[PDB]
Design a protein around this ligand. Structure first.
Ligand code: VKL
Ligand code: NA
Ligand code: NA
Ligand code: ZN
Length: 265
């Protein structure tokens, strides 16, 4: 039985997707929810914003996991090996994992939008503020997390993404994981670090309002072949009815009492 017949655990189907989440996670209707549409002409340039400092040379990737909602590439976050600081931030944030959101078709998949335009996918590099000691404590704080969001447009292949693409055959179904040591996340970045920033939330339940979002202006180009292989993953576990892992994105939420800032003019 597919989940709709079995359990109302949250997901991305018609019967458990974003329009339902508020019933079990009422903060879904909160005051600083993500994602949002980035209206490029109304985001204000803030000359007090610093360049973003991304220090990933010493990163220790560990494992890639299909968690039934996306796949996470996990990192050792027990030391300041892979850290994000500067930009809008006043602390040091350790990389814990990255994951993507993507569509069933190239014209959808991103969570943030830019002037209402959707990208084929969006990469989230999730970091937590070291003053809180652990991720679980950080998600009890309004400055607990910093997420670096990067858009994926379809065009030329992204060579630094290919190791991710190549391993997906080995984590097809929920609960499968594979070794993913020796992976360099610097290969997922665009050239420019110019960004928009605003206060928001996790985009998956529990939707906690802990995130300083840092969304890069420059998308990365990926090939259609790269993103279409993401779409061969499964939401289900092995031996359960097959549900392709596609359209695992939350749509844009109301901006409410927030103004997006830009690091660039
Ligand atoms: C696949 N599956 N389906 C069911 C299911 C039982 C009544 C699914 F009225 C349904 F719609 C009535 C039960 N389970 C499975 N797999 C494990 C148990
Ligand atoms: Na090292
Ligand atoms: Na700040
Ligand atoms: Zn995400």
């Amino acid at each position: 039985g597919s989940p709709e017949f079995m359990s109302h655990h949250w997901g991305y189907g018609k019967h458990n997707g974003p329009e339902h989440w508020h019933k079990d996670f009422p903060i879904a209707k909160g005051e600083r929810q993500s994602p949002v549409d980035i209206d490029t002409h109304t985001a204000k340039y803030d000359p007090s914003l610093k360049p973003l400092s991304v220090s990933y040379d010493q990163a220790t990737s560990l494992r890639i996991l299909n968690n039934g909602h996306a796949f996470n590439v996990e990192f050792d976050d027990s030391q300041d090996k892979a850290v994000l600081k500067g930009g809008p931030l006043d602390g040091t944030y350790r990389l814990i994992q990255f994951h993507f959101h993507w569509g069933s078709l190239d014209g959808q998949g991103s969570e943030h939008t830019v002037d209402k335009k959707k990208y084929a996918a969006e990469l989230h590099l999730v970091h937590w503020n070291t003053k809180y000691g652990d991720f679980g404590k950080a998600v009890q704080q309004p400055d607990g997390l910093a997420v670096l969001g990067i858009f994926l447009k379809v065009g030329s292949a992204k060579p630094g993404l290919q190791k991710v693409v190549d391993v997906l055959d080995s984590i097809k179904t929920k609960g499968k994981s594979a070794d993913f040591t020796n992976f360099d996340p610097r290969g997922l970045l665009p050239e420019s670090l110019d960004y928009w920033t605003y206060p928001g939330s996790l985009t998956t339940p529990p939707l906690l309002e802990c995130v300083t979002w840092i969304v890069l202006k420059e998308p990365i180009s990926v090939s259609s072949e790269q993103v279409l292989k993401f779409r061969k993953l499964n939401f289900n576990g092995e031996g359960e009815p097959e549900e392709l892992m596609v359209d695992n994105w939350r749509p844009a939420q109301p901006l409410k009492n927030r103004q997006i800032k830009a690091s660039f003019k």
